[PDB]
Design a binder for this molecule. Sequence first.
Ligand SMILES: [Zn+2]
Length: 219
Amino acid sequence: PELELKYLNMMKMAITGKESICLPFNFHSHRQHTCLDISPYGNEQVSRIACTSCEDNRILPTASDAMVAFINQTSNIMKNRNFYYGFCKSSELLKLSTNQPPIFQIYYLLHAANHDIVPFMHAEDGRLHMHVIFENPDVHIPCDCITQMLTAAREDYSVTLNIVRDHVVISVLCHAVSASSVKIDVTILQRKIDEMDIPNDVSESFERYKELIQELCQS
Ligand SMILES: [Zn+2]
């Protein structure tokens, strides 16, 4: 007889809330309090209200937490190593990123949720773009994560989730570079990136995607 409230617990059962999405999916078409779970069953949009493929009680960093991380890039090089491998050792692309904090911010937010991601960097017309490649086909983007990505990008970027080569890619496209309100010491960052050893397997991974990277590198 320890159950009087054992039947009252489920104060809110949730099943109905899902919906199918059409690709290429532009993140401007968000649904306020919903997520994105991409599986082989199809592409859908389910709310935290309904979705229990969630961070039980685990918290996610805000766009602000990502900006502070951006400001402290130089201190956390080896933590953010995956991000920097995306520049393919290119130093021009690196100084471009120091002018565009949302590029790092969006990666920081995406990495926080999904750790198994491959970022790639490209530039046209003097603006930096980013393509995040998902290793697993069991893609899931939490609501909190998406909301923060929309805060990080806002008026300048076109974040788009699309599936090619039976894999998922989020394409961050910079349409304008309205000047940043902060500045990173670039020279310190650039010397520290040259100090980094590019591991064979990490460099071999790119050539496993080079049949696909150039296809995305048309913007
Ligand atoms: Zn979710």
